[PDB]
C-alpha cells in the first residue's frame, strides 16, 4: 500500500532509515489531510503531491 507509491528508499537517497523494536508510542498518524495524492489520474502523478 506504501511500497508501490512515492518514497521507498532509492539507491540515490541521502539519508538513513532507522527502525527498531519498541512498543512505545501509538496513534497520531491520521492527523494528515493536507497531504493527499492521486490514485487514478489522467493528468499524471508527480511524487508526493
Amino acid at each position: 500500500k506504501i511500497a508501490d507509491y512515492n518514497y521507498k528508499l532509492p539507491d540515490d537517497f541521502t539519508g538513513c532509515v532507522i527502525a527498531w523494536n519498541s512498543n512505545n508510542l501509538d496513534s497520531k498518524v491520521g492527523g494528515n489531510y493536507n497531504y493527499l495524492y492521486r490514485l487514478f489520474r489522467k493528468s499524471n502523478l508527480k511524487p508526493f503531491e
Partner: nanobody
Framework: QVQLVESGGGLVQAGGSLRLSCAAS????????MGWYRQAPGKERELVAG????????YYADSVKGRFTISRDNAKNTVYLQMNSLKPEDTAVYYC????????????WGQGTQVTVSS
C-alpha cells in the same frame, strides 16, 4: 484496513438519507475520506461513491448512482458517511472505507454494517 469500527445501518426507507459513522486505521482514516463498498448475493462488489475531500463535489459510478455526500465534523474526529436518495436496489452489505484499494474476498474488513431500503 481490517478491524474497522462502524455504527449505523439497519432498515431505512427509500428517499431520505442514512448517515453511517466509521473510524479506522491511519491507512484508511487518512486517505480521501471513507466511502462505500457494497455487495449483496445479487450484486457484485463495487466501489459506490467517494469524495476528494469536503466540498460540493463528490463522485459516484453510473453503475450505482446517488448524490452521496461524505463529510468530517471537528466535534469528534471520525468520518460521517451519508447516503442520500436510497432505493431498494441499495440493499447490500456495506463497508465504510476509503476509496483506494478494496476488501479482498479472502479477507474481511471490520464488522461492516447491513443497510436495507424499504424491506
Amino acid at each position: 484496513q481490517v478491524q474497522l469500527v462502524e455504527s449505523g445501518g439497519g432498515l431505512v426507507q427509500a428517499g431520505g438519507s442514512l448517515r453511517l459513522s466509521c473510524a479506522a486505521s491511519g491507512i484508511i482514516f487518512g486517505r480521501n475520506a471513507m466511502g462505500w463498498y457494497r455487495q449483496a448475493p445479487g450484486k457484485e462488489r463495487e466501489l459506490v461513491a467517494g469524495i476528494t475531500r469536503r466540498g460540493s463535489i463528490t463522485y459516484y459510478a453510473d453503475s450505482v448512482k446517488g448524490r452521496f455526500t461524505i463529510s468530517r465534523d471537528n466535534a469528534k474526529n471520525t468520518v460521517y458517511l451519508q447516503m442520500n436518495s436510497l432505493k431498494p436496489e441499495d440493499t447490500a452489505v456495506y463497508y465504510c472505507a476509503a476509496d483506494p484499494a478494496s476488501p479482498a474476498p479472502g479477507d474481511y474488513w471490520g464488522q461492516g454494517t447491513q443497510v436495507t431500503v424499504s424491506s
